[model samples]
Target chain A: SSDICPGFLQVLEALLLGSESNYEAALKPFNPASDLQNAGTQLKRLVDTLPQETRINIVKLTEKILTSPLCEQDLRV
Target chain B: SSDICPGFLQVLEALLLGSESNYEAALKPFNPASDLQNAGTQLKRLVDTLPQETRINIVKLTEKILTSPLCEQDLRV
Candidate 1:
């Protein structure tokens, strides 16, 4: 009913934690977005704040999520 | 660079398409968020527009994507 995309600080930390409730917490807020901070800005900032390797994992994780249902396997190689 | 979160109209259709190029197209725009239309609005509307079953897929796919790393299997049952 509302545009409440998760913010970076809370979401990335949860994603990094990757715990059950934590993961649930991550998306819990993601059911919305923030125009002031903005979700993508939050992501860019969080990714920047994270160690490069972990940041890369987020990129990979999200990319994989979006792509798999679309198509994969051949795309992997 | 800009907040260009993909709109549900474009994104969900692409998700339903589930093709390589089409999927690529889905996310190609997702690198940002559209505040006025807003990414979450985009998602909610697209989910609404879809057939009830397919609408469920968006829910499943996103929840799965978020949870798989944190926990699953146990949660599924």
Candidate 2:
């Protein structure tokens, strides 16, 4: 419905649209502890901008990813 | 380590600490779409305050909740 954080939203949309690489890069900016707050803030802002249906889909997809052992391993790090 | 958004962080910590009700309430302020940016900002800010280990644990727990059908139903709304 709204477009708040385009770059952040683009990555998330791509992930939900189906791309493991995009999911991997979803939190890329937070690595090495650079601007954790800013990155998190951006992500949250982006997520907040999506439509309700899109949010649900993203959550569902995230659930699927979290359940996958392969994804879990990467997420753990 | 840092305490950016105590209220937001408190709910997440409680959820991670094991409380389904707390988890449900974590996004309470966001219902009806009020201050989505500020809410996401608060959530991300709170998340950024946690240690890396804690962050990983939270993410793991979040994964679990997301996968749970009950949680998914509620989260979808």
Candidate 3:
């Protein structure tokens, strides 16, 4: 029914893969082409299911991802 | 390296292309596969880079786009 992954399930799965804390944060937004709001809900659910350490890792990773060399290069400003 | 536009550069490009106000919003959330958070940063940059009139137009259009048929049809919620 939903296009793409439909939820942040993919992201959760990716985090579970143990890439890194920053990578997880870099990949936080679960806003799909469909079911974006629901994706947010599912993400919350996963956040609860996840171990605290795992969640922390992903969140921190995301913060780093938010502020990286790539970010500087985009230059919308 | 980034799977998608890495930022909202593509979206800003589209908005500047002049599809419509709502069109820009519907096309919001650049969250690329590689740099979703950076996409937000890029979008903010685009918002600032645009001329004042154009920026206001896109923002209003975004409001409509964010809560309209496409959003509803996608979720049916």
Candidate 4:
């Protein structure tokens, strides 16, 4: 399943693991998925169960991950 | 710039324009960017400035848009 969809759970953990707040209650029961949407939903559920502080942290990290394609050093006006 | 990247502002507007609660104040001064990170930043800033009702709507919409790849007729465990 993951072969067809790369970084499925890997991305999940990155978003899940680094909570400045203890998100163990949220992390323990995650049902991992090879499907990005399912995986994303699980990640959201976990983050959403926690505080706004955790939510903001995950959003910043997610933005950083999703915007990785912009690293080619090109300029746009 | 958009030629290098697709759906830049299109995605932004989709995220920005559909606030059930009025987001005109947040939307008014938006700086559009061809770079996705910048565009994403602008969109987030707009959403972040608004209420949680708007936030959840955008999140569900984003989840739907992003998970579009799984539409093929296939099963995963």
Candidate 5:
């Protein structure tokens, strides 16, 4: 489990990519109405890959990650 | 893109699986408090597989799918 944590962190980083490439870029413009059909498609694809239990964990993790300024790189503890 | 789309649709069908083996199973005792840690974790993994644009679509799709009666099968238009 320890060995997988680092790589898993990287995966977390990749999973959170939205709007832009970096923190600053993500803050450029916020448009809730511009969510687009592609976003739903992508998320649906994601949910399929995940099991029921883990899917719930990811949503909680995402909410936490969004509230934090530190990306996955800084989460290695 | 077309061939990939159908397979992708299959994936979408799979993604919608939650408390249900079928439609009837989902109507059991529903509890937001019991979403559990694994659901979020699984969701995060699923999110990583998709592109940025598609991710937005997935989230939006989830909102509709939750409310729709036909499940993923009817969305194939």
Candidate 6:
């Protein structure tokens, strides 16, 4: 096994997306106010740091998250 | 911002899935042999430690990664 982590970018994006999805879940029970737009912005910033080819899918993924039906919930209420 | 990270479970799952997917991509370039089945087993172990509700989707997600079309490429050569 390699000492360092492989696929750091993929892992990082997965965490971001997962956390965003989790936030959506937590809304029902915890009802915590959420900020998905800002989250999307954060993801975009991270995507900017990656290579071009890598950036494309991640950008699409982030956009999908940003526009996901789950995100449309009344989170701030 | 809370000192503690919110939605740790979700974030963790995402990272696992993302890293797995990344491994698939890496196979084409680095030609590194892969072990997705072992990875899936590891994910199952992690899922076992989580709540039942949380475990369900993660289990499904891991299985999807294990069985995805991208994973069909032979990295063992």
Cα error, candidate 4, residue A75 (Å): 33
Q: Model 6 Cα displacement at B75 (Å)?
A: 51
**Model 6, span B8-27: residue lDDT tens:** 22334444344445433422
Spell out the clash pairs found in candidate 6: none
Can you tell me which runs of candidate 4 are displaced by over 4 Å?
A1-77, B1-40, B65-77
The model with the greater TM-score, 5 or 6, is 5
Kindly report which residue pairs in candidate 4 clash with one another.
none
Task: Locate the minimum summed-lDDT window of 10 residues in model 2 chain B.
Answer: B1-10
Greater-lDDT candidate between 2 and 4: 2
Query: Against the hidden true structure, what lDDT does model 1 obtain?
Result: 0.39
Tell me the TM-score of each prediction against the true structure: 0.24, 0.30, 0.28, 0.23, 0.25, 0.23
lDDT of 1 by residue, A1-77 (tens): 01112243345455444444554455544443233223223233333444545444544444433344232223223
Instruction: List pairs with backbone clashes in candidate 3.
Output: A21-A61, A22-A61, A25-A62, A26-A62, B21-B61
| Model 2 ranges off by over 4 Å | A1-18, A32-54, A57-77, B1-3, B27-56, B59-77
User: What TM-score, to 2 decimals, does candidate 1 have?
Assistant: 0.24
State the displacement of the C-alpha of residue A1, model 6, in Å, after optimal TM-score superposition. Answer: 43
How close is each model in CA RMSD to the real structure?
17.4, 17.3, 17.0, 15.4, 16.2, 18.3
Overlapping backbone residue pairs in candidate 1 total: 10
Best-fitting candidate, measured by lDDT?
Answer: 2
- For B21-68, candidate 4 gives per-residue lDDT tens digits of 333323233332324334343334434454555454445533443344
Tens digits of per-residue lDDT for model 5 on A1-77?
Answer: 12122322332343444222432232223222345533533443444454544644554544443332322223233
Per-prediction DockQ = 0.03, 0.03, 0.03, 0.03, 0.16, 0.04
Model 6 chain A lDDT-worst window of ten? A1-10
Q: Candidate 2: lDDT of B19?
A: 39
Q: What are the clashing pairs of model 2?
A: none
The i-RMS of candidate 4 is 12.6
| Reference-based lDDT, residue B38, model 6 | 34
